[PDB]
């Protein structure tokens, strides 16, 4: 959503339960058209950021099918707001956010993911 | 305190405000007698762990005056509970906990610090 209501933050906007064997979970976001991606915004659960992801690895796909890793996973444990800027703006149509298991929590709690950038004529 | 009331966690049990120039703040705990220290317990603000310390460096002093660093500072950002066990129990009379500035917070919030160990005849 463009702006969900963030005033009370009861439990979480979105929650994920982790199996003991797995540590990474991937959120694949498919855009209707390729955009000039510039910066990713990830907002964890602000009321209880124990469920904030330890590290996040972004992936971009210009054709929307070929997942390709972005950078090494930046550690966001203890961060109230995740801003992954790109020095080089990338033409991407699909974005895979692979979130790592938190340091001492088996659940992931997120509030809002933004996909900031431009278009070809915007 | 042995057990402070942790049921609501309104603001914090203890809070620290960070100057822009400094990044480390030291809590020096002086015991009346030297004890066989075994493990440190640090509880951050459980309701809002944005103020949890990014990294903590412990220091022990057997004579109580000569501060001497323990290990490299363990990163506790995103940890609801900090348990620094010692494989070698150390005879310590003073314990200096040097807490680092959080990743995106200018305040530190702690709830309870425990100093676990034995005595000479206990």
From Swiss-Prot, chains A, B:
<feature type="region of interest" description="HRRAR loop; important for DIABLO/SMAC and HTRA2 binding">
    <location>
        <begin position="6"/>
        <end position="10"/>
    </location>
</feature>
<comment type="function">
    <text>Anti-apoptotic protein known as inhibitor of apoptosis (IAP) which can regulate cell death by controlling caspases and by acting as an E3 ubiquitin-protein ligase. Unlike most IAPs, does not contain a RING domain and it is not a RING-type E3 ligase. Instead acts as a dual E2/E3 enzyme that combines ubiquitin conjugating (E2) and ubiquitin ligase (E3) activities in a single polypeptide. Ubiquitination is mediated by a non-canonical E1 ubiquitin activating enzyme UBA6.</text>
</comment>
<protein>
    <recommendedName>
        <fullName>Dual E2 ubiquitin-conjugating enzyme/E3 ubiquitin-protein ligase BIRC6</fullName>
    </recommendedName>
</protein>
<comment type="similarity">
    <text>Belongs to the BIRC6 family.</text>
</comment>
<comment type="subunit">
    <text>Homodimer; antiparallel. Interacts with RNF41. Interacts with DIABLO/SMAC, likely with higher affinity to SMAC dimer than SMAC monomer; this interaction blocks the substrate-binding site and inhibits the caspase inhibition activity of BIRC6. Interacts with KIF23/MKLP1, USP8/UBPY, BIRC5/survivin, MAP2K1/MEK1, RAB8A/RAB8, RAB11A/RAB11, PLK1, EXOC3/SEC6 and EXOC4/SEC8.</text>
</comment>
């Amino acid at each position: 959503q463009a702006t969900p209501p963030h005033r009370r933050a009861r439990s979480a906007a979105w929650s994920y339960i982790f199996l003991p064997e797995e540590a990474w979970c991937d959120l694949t976001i498919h855009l209707p058209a390729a955009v000039l991606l510039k910066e990713i915004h990830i907002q964890p659960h602000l009321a209880s950021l124990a469920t904030c992801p330890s590290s996040v690895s972004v992936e971009v796909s210009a054709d929307g099918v070929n997942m390709l890793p972005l950078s090494t996973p930046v550690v966001t444990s203890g961060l109230t707001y995740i801003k992954i800027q790109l020095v080089k703006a990338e033409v991407a149509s699909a974005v895979c956010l692979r979130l790592h298991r938190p340091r001492d929590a088996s659940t992931l709690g997120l509030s809002q993911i933004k996909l900031l950038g431009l278009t070809a004529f915007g």
